Amino acid sequence: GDQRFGDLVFRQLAPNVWQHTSYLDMPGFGAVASNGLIVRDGGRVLVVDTAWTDDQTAQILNWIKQEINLPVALAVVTHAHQDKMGGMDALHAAGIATYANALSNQLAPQEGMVAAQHSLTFAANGWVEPATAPNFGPLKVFYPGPGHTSDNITVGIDGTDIAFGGCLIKDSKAKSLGNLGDADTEHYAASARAFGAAFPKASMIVMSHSAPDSRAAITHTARMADKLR
Ligand SMILES: Cn1c(=O)cc(CP(=O)(O)O)c2ccccc21
Numbered sequence: 001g002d003q004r005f006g007d008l009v010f011r012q013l014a015p016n017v018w019q020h021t022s023y024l025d026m027p028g029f030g031a032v033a034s035n036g037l038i039v040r041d042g043g044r045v046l047v048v049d050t051a052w053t054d055d056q057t058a059q060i061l062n063w064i065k066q067e068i069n070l071p072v073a074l075a076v077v078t079h080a081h082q083d084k085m086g087g088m089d090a091l092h093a094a095g096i097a098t099y100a101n102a103l104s105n106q107l108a109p110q111e112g113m114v115a116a117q118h119s120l121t122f123a124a125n126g127w128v129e130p131a132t133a134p135n136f137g138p139l140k141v142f143y144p145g146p147g148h149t150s151d152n153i154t155v156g157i158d159g160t161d162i163a164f165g166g167c168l169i170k171d172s173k174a175k176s177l178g179n180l181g182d183a184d185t186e187h188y189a190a191s192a193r194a195f196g197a198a199f200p201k202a203s204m205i206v207m208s209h210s211a212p213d214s215r216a217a218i219t220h221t222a223r224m225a226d227k228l229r
């Protein structure tokens with residue numbers, strides 16, 4: 001199932017959906033995997049999250065060229081940390097339109113990230129304002145509230161059973177909530193539950209640092225975040 005392609009790993013999740021995985025040595029944490037998504041929508045490809053680095057992100061584009069061979073119409077990145085935005089320059093060098101939460105773009109320079117070209121804004125209930133996410137096809141973008149970071153966003157794939165929680169959601173056996181350095185600990189639990197309520201039909205939950213899991217990832221993450229209060 002897993003396909004090793006250079007230093008990256010790709011896994012098909014559905015007929016039109018693949019997970020990309022890249023690794024970065026975290027001095028003190030080992031070589032940390034980070035996952036994003038690749039979605040074919042008709043004659044074009046949509047990407048969720050970069051890899052950790054520009055070189056790795058260029059390799060994602062190389063894999064897309066070889067395995068799908070359709071243009072990448074856009075990428076959306078899910079918060080202003082390196083695992084999700086570290087490869088922005090590679091997307092720009094490739095001519096790909098890029099999108100992030102307005103707050104992620106505001107934070108990008110101080111986080112050492114390059115901002116996306118376009119800013120998403122969100123209604124009070126968390127759903128993306130559609131005018132800011134043109135041509136997103138099956139991607140349904142939802143801001144669940146502050147959690148792993150204040151800017152974290154999530155993405156459902158219409159027509160599939162898949163929703164992507166990024167670094168907000170941990171797997172059903174996870175022992176911790178990971179890096180809380182930029183987290184909102186008071187609101188995390190509610191934000192995790194809001195993600196679940198936004199995508200009630202998603203039976204496959206994809207996340208940044210674990211293999212895809214059932215919805216028990218959501219309940220378990222929320223129950224763990226209850227202890228942060
Ligand atoms: C220590 N530290 C960080 O400062 C930031 C990240 C990326 P993120 O997962 O988006 O928070 C991180 C990831 C895994 C392990 C340690 C880490």
Ligand SMILES: [Zn+2]
Binds near residue numbers: 081149167
């Ligand atoms: Zn993060």
Ligand SMILES: [Zn+2]
Binds near residue numbers: 178179208209
């Ligand atoms: Zn993470």
